[PDB]
Design a protein around this ligand. Structure first.
Ligand code: 2BO
Ligand code: 2BO
Lengths: 394, 394
C-alpha cells in the first residue's frame, strides 16, 4: 500500500525540475561500445566521463576471451562460489591477482561494491572499531555499517585526526582502517606511509580500496601499496574489475588465513551468485595485457599530463588530483548542471558532482582520461569546454 | 598490522577441520558449463545443487546473444547507470521486465544482492519501520540494516506476529514489509494474500523478492504476485537474473515515481558499475524464451513432481516445499557434511544446510530440479542418495 510511501518520495523534486528545464543529462542510453567516442541518439560524443582508464573494453583479444568463455562455460554459474558456483577460471583469476598485488591469496566478488561489503562486514565485531577516511567510497561506509563494530570517520587524509581517534580507543579491541587508494572525487592519493605508520603503532589492520589505482599507479599498475613500497604494511588489498580491467566484479587479496575466513564468512560472497564466465575471462585477459604491454599505462599518463597542463594553461581551476581524474571546479550547482548538459549537447561527456554530495561552492565536473584518447580529442573537448564555460559565465 | 586481526579469525576452525577429515566439499572448481552434469577434476557429476531452474545457461541462443552483445558493446560499461554506464539494451530490459511483471517501470542492478540493498536502504528512514520475515534472504536483512529505519523481524510466515508488531507502531510513521516469495531453505511460499491484507489495513508498502519465483511460479513464470493475482497489492517486485534467467544482475519493478526515486537515491545503483552488455543480452534472450516456450516451466514441474514423489516413496523426510527446491532432512551437522562429501565423491552434487544457519536437528541437504534434468538422472541420483544415507546411518 502506498499512502506513507508516496509521502516518503514526495519531496524529491530535483529530477522533475532538471527534466522540465531541459537540463537532465543522466541515464543517457549509449548505443555503442564504451570508447573515446560513444553514440547517443545516433550522434557521436567524446567520452571524458569513463572509468575505463586503459581503453580496454574495446580490445578484441579481451572480447574474444569473453566470447570463448561463453562458448565453453555458458552464460552464468547459477550459484554461490562455496556451493555450485566456482569455476576453475575463478580460481585461476584469484591466483593471478594474488601474484599481481603480491599477496598469498584472493577471493573474488561479483561486484566491486560487494568486495568492500565482505571484509568490512565480518572482520571487526562487537567491541571493535572501523576507522574510515570521511571521503571513502559509499561501498566502504555501507560495508562498515553492516559490521557489528563501531564505525568512526576521520578527516580526509588527516593523519593527526586518525591518530587522535585511535588513541581514545580501548587497547583490548581490534581496529581496522579502510581507505580509498586514489579517491575519485578529487583524484588524490591516500597518505599511505603515515597511515600505515599509525596503524603499526596501534596494531590496526589496514585495508586499501584500489578501484581507481589498479592499472593506474604502482609497478605495472599493481596499485597503491605497490606505489609506496608498503605491501608488507597493508593487510588487505581490495580492487574492482569495472575500471582499468574493463569488466565487472572485484576481489580482496591478503594472507591465506584471513582470505579463508572471508570467503566462508562474508555474506556478500556466501549469498550472491559468482561472476559470469565471460567477466572472469575478460578480467584475466585484461590483467595479462596490463602487465605485458606497458604502453597502455604510459599513454594513460601521457594523456593525463597533457590534458592537465592544457586545462591549467586555459585557466581552469583544478582540484588536488594525482591521477587521470581531473576535477574542474564550477562552484554553483545550477552552473554545473547547465555546463554538463550544454557540453553533452555539444558532443562532450563529463560527470557532474553537485549537492548534496558536495557543497554548492565545491560543485565540479570530472574529466577523466583513457589510454586510447588522442591529443586531438583532448584539444576538441577543451575547445568546447572553454566555449561552454564562456556561455555559462564561469 | 595483524595482531588483533589474527585474534579475530583464530576461533574459526571448522574449515581446517573439514579439510583435515577429508569432508571439505566447498568451492569445488567446475570445469564445464553449469548443466545437469558438470565436470570436476575431470570426472562427471550430476548437478542437483543449482539455481538454474530452466537449464538455460547452456541454451545456444542465449550464448549467441551474449557473444553478439560483446561484439557490439564490448566487455563492460565502466560507469554507473546515471552517468556513463547506461546502454539502450539496459533500458530495453527494464521496459521488458516491467511488462513481464505488470508494473510501470523497473531499475536494474548489477547483482540480485544489490537489488535488495537499493530499495531497503533508501525508502524507509528515521522514525520509519521495515518489517522482515525472519527467514528473509541475507541481502534483505543487509539492505534493511543500511536504512536509517528500525528493522523488526516477524515469525516465519506468521501473520498474527506481523499484524501484532505493526499494531504497536506509531500511526505517523511509514512502514515497509519485505518478504521472499519462495524461501530457498525449505522452498515454501509466502502467505501473500494475508500479508497484503494486513499491509492494506496498516498502509504498509509491500516488497516481494522473487529470486526463486521468476521462471518458476506465476503466469509464464512472472512470480509470486502473479501466482496469487495480487499485482495491485504489491508495491515493489524485486527479482534476480542469476537463477532461471541464467545470468547475473537483478531488478526492482514498481510505480514510475517510486522507481524514479530509487534509481536516483539507491547507493547500490548510484555507486556501482552497470551490468555488462553480455549479461543484459543473455537476460533479454532468456526472458523471451521463458515466455515464448512454455515447455521449460512445464518440465521443471514434471521433474519436480516426479522427484518429490520418488523421494517420499523411498522414505526421505522432506521439508514443507512448494517449489523445485526439495529439502531433505538429515538432523546432524556431522552426517550432513559426511553425506554431502560421499555423494560428491559418488557423482551427485547437493547443497548442505548446517549450523550456524540452522540447528543441528534441522540440518538438511537441498536437492533442486532443472527443466533439463531427465527422469533417468533423477533416478540415478536418488539410487546413490539411498546408498549414501544407508552408509551414513540416516
Ligand atoms: C531470495 C534471494 N534474494 C536475493 C538473492 C541475491 O541474488 P544474487 O546476487 O543474484 O545471487 C538470492 C541469492 N541466492 C543464492 C544464495 O544465497 O545462495 C545466490 C547464490 O544466488 C536469493 O536467494
Ligand atoms: C573507490 C571505489 N570502490 C568501490 C567501488 C565499487 O566498484 P563497482 O561495484 O565495481 O562499481 C567504486 C565504484 N566507483 C564508481 C562510482 O561509484 O561511480 C562505479 C560506477 O564503478 C569505487 O570508486
Amino acid at each position: 500500500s502506498k499512502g506513507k510511501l508516496g509521502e516518503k518520495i514526495s519531496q524529491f523534486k530535483i529530477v522533475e525540475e532538471l527534466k522540465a528545464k531541459g537540463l537532465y543529462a543522466y541515464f543517457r542510453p549509449i548505443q555503442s561500445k564504451q570508447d573515446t567516442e560513444v553514440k547517443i541518439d545516433g550522434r557521436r560524443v567524446l567520452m571524458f566521463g569513463s572509468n575505463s582508464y586503459l581503453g580496454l573494453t574495446t580490445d578484441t583479444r579481451i572480447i574474444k576471451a569473453a566470447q570463448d568463455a561463453l562458448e565453453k562455460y555458458g552464460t552464468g554459474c547459477a550459484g554461490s562460489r562455496f556451493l555450485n558456483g566456482t569455476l576453475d577460471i575463478h580460481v585461476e583469476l584469484e591466483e593471478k591477482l594474488s601474484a599481481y598485488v603480491g599477496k598469498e591469496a584472493a577471493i573474488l566478488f561479483s561486484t566491486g561494491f560487494q568486495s568492500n561489503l565482505g571484509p568490512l562486514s565480518c572482520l571487526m565485531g562487537r567491541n571493535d572499531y572501523i576507522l574510515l577516511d570521511e571521503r571513502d567510497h559509499a561501498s566502504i561506509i555501507d560495508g562498515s555499517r553492516l559490521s557489528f563494530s563501531k564505525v568512526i570517520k576521520y578527516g580526509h587524509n588527516n593523519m593527526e585526526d586518525l591518530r587522535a581517534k585511535l588513541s581514545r580507543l580501548p587497547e583490548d579491541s581490534a581496529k581496522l582502517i579502510c581507505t580509498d587508494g586514489i579517491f575519485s572525487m578529487e583524484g588524490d592519493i591516500v597518505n599511505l606511509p603515515e597511515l600505515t605508520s599509525i596503524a603499526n603503532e596501534f596494531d590496526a589492520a589496514v585495508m586499501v580500496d584500489d578501484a581507481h589505482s589498479l592499472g593506474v599507479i604502482g609497478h605495472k599498475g599493481a596499485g597503491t601499496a605497490s606505489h609506496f613500497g608498503l605491501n608488507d604494511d597493508v593487510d588487505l588489498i581490495m580492487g574492482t574489475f569495472s575500471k582499468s580491467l574493463a569488466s565487472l566484479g572485484g576481489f580482496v587479496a591478503g594472507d591465506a588465513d584471513v582470505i579463508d575466513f572471508l570467503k566462508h564468512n562474508a555474506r556478500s560472497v556466501m549469498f550472491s551468485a559468482s561472476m559470469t564466465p565471460a567477466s572472469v575471462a575478460s578480467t584475466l585477459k585484461a590483467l595479462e595485457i596490463i602487465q605485458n604491454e606497458p604502453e597502455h599505462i604510459e599513454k594513460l599518463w601521457k594523456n593525463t599530463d597533457y590534458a592537465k597542463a592544457q586545462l591549467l594553461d586555459h585557466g581552469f581551476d583544478l582540484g588536488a588530483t594525482e591521477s587521470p581524474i581531473l576535477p574542474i571546479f564550477i562552484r554553483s550547482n545550477e552552473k554545473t548542471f547547465w555546463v554538463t548538459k550544454m557540453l553533452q549537447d555539444d558532443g562532450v561527456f563529463v560527470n557532474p558532482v553537485v549537492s548534496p554530495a558536495v557543497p554548492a561552492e565545491e560543485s565540479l565536473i570530472r574529466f577523466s582520461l583513457m589510454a586510447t584518447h588522442t591529443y586531438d580529442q583532448i584539444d576538441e573537448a577543451i575547445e568546447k569546454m572553454v566555449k561552454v564555460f564562456k556561455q555559462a559565465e564561469v
